[PDB]
Amino acid sequence: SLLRRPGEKTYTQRCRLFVGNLPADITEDEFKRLFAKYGEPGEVFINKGKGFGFIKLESRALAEIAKAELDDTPMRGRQLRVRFATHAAALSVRNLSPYVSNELLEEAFSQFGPIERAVVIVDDRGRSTGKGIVEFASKPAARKAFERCSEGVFLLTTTPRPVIVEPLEQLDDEDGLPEKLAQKNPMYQKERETPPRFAQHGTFEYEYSQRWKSLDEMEKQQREQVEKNMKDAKDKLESEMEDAYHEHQANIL
Amino acid sequence: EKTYTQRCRLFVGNLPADITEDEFKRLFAKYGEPGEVFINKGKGFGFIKLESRALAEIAKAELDDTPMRGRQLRVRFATAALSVRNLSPYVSNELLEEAFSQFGPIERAVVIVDDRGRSTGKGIVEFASKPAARKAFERCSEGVFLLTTTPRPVIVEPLEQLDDEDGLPEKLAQKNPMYQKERETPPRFAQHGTFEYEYSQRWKSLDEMEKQQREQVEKNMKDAKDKLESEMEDAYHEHQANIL
Ligand SMILES: [Zn+2]
Ligand SMILES: [Zn+2]
């Protein structure tokens, strides 16, 4: 129903909402009427047996409004839980040149299948982190990109930097671990009997904790030394391979 | 929940050159009583706090990329947060908030969980200000901060703020000589027996070795950390235990 199309691509997986705690006797019509305010519905999936469903709306904006408006609202004695659906066809990409843009990444990955979005993750100064996200329309397109970039060498720019493609890690930093669930542990009462505190010089917990911190600091130093050791190995490889291939030199063979 | 917090604060860019404060407030009148408003006329952007997170989310979704006297507005949540790790599975969002509240007002505290709702042992604590966040960071770095009876020192680090929404648009890329050199060759799968393939395949082997070595460091130090409890229980003595 939107007069101006929000963009080139609509009803993407970033426009998909998860709705939990539906009533036992939900119907598709009732489910669609819940979202009627937010334009023409796209794909609808309802698990009537398990009390949840999915809907795609036309735009990310409409999904954000629906979530904000419908989350924690009553339906026949149940508070609806509305969340953005976790993306089923998303990949992490890393080892990106700093001169790879969102559009280059999308253009590149579009060869694997229809692509919804690609983004280069930037730091607080707008500089590339060398990492990105690619969101495909279909799981098979994501699987082909994952398999082909794993087996082969996919290059986006002049500098030979193979794109490293991994499953996108999707952890929950919205709901987290509420005290309602934590309390179900037997030893919870015993763990909370001592309040948050600074440990004091001379106590067992202070001495244990300072030694633990010293091992953690040693682990940090060793992990940094490994990165430095492997950077030197990668720079030595580059120099040896340039020489093997006579990169700065004409040679018939 | 608290009202008009830092998580209710919106950035609005691409304001008209002759924007007025009242014109700016009328933009957000739909969303009830405005909180603190500030306009940087210098650069054509403004900030407004709305009553709740839900209202700020709706305003951002309804006003972003809408026209205002010539240009399309850019509406973002305005961006004081700390990473926390070595959390025990007993730590809830509410315990994290209660514990870190002594350093200053908390915007959000959450324990990061997996899709089965199990603690990852990591969390995020967002304060209303960078000073309160620096204080909490300095105190927990220097000192031993404990949340529960079983001693596990909370390991606190500034959370680096990353952008996965706007990212790096082609229009904002600097077209300097490194851009020109990099863009000269297009996206491709390299061919066996070329320098770019053979080097890249050896690079991947080294990158895999680096991951395995990092994992071995983590496993060697996990063994050391686990042994420490028993070693400490055996070796601990009070300061007055052996005095002449
Ligand atoms: Zn002492
Ligand atoms: Zn080969």
Numbering used by the authors:
A (entry chain A): 283 to 535
B (entry chain B): 290 to 368, 371 to 535
Direct quotes from the study:
SFPQ is an RNA- and DNA-binding protein that is involved in many aspects of RNA biogenesis as well as DNA damage repair. The DBHS family proteins share a high sequence similarity within the central DBHS domain which comprises two RNA-recognition motifs (RRMs), a NonA/paraspeckle (NOPS) domain and a long coiled-coil domain. It has previously been shown that SFPQ homo- and hetero-dimerizes via the central DBHS domain and polymerizes via the extended coiled-coil domain, which is critical for its nuclear functions, such as transcriptional regulation and paraspeckle formation. We have previously discovered that SFPQ directly binds to zinc, which promotes the formation of infinite polymers of both the SFPQ homodimers and SFPQ/NONO heterodimers.
Here we characterize two familial ALS (fALS)-associated SFPQ variants, which cause amino acid substitutions in the proximity of the SFPQ zinc-coordinating centre (N533H and L534I). Both mutants display increased zinc-binding affinities, which can be explained by the presence of a second zinc-binding site revealed by the 1.83 Å crystal structure of the human SFPQ L534I mutant. The calculated affinity (IC50) of SFPQ N533H (0.25 µM) and L534I (0.54 µM) binding to zinc was approximately 5.8- and 2.7-fold higher than that of the WT protein (1.45 µM), respectively, confirming that these fALS-associated mutations cause significant increases in SFPQ zinc-binding affinity. The final model consisted of two chains of SFPQ (residues 283–535 in Chain A and residues 290–368, 371–535 in Chain B), two Zn atoms (one of the two with half occupancy), and 277 water molecules. A closer inspection of the two zinc centres showed that the first zinc coordinating centre (Zn centre 1) is almost indistinguishable from that of SFPQ WT, coordinated by His A483, His B530, His A*528 and a carbonyl oxygen of Leu A*535, where the asterisk (*) denotes a symmetry-related dimer (x, y, z – 1). However, the anomalous signal from the second centre (Zn centre 2) is significantly lower than that of Zn centre 1, indicating that this site is not fully occupied. The second zinc coordination centre is composed of three amino acid residues: Glu B*489, Glu B529 and His B*483 (symmetry operator: x, y, z – 1). The side chains of Glu B529 and His B*483 are in the ‘in’ position coordinating zinc, whereas in the absence of zinc, they take on the ‘out’ conformation. Zinc in the second centre is modelled with the occupancy of 0.5 in the final structure with a comparable B-factor value (28.1 Å2) to those ligating atoms (average B-factor of 26.8 Å2). Taken together, the crystal structure of SFPQ L534I in complex with zinc reveals an additional zinc-binding site, providing the structural basis for the apparent increase in zinc-binding affinity in this mutant.
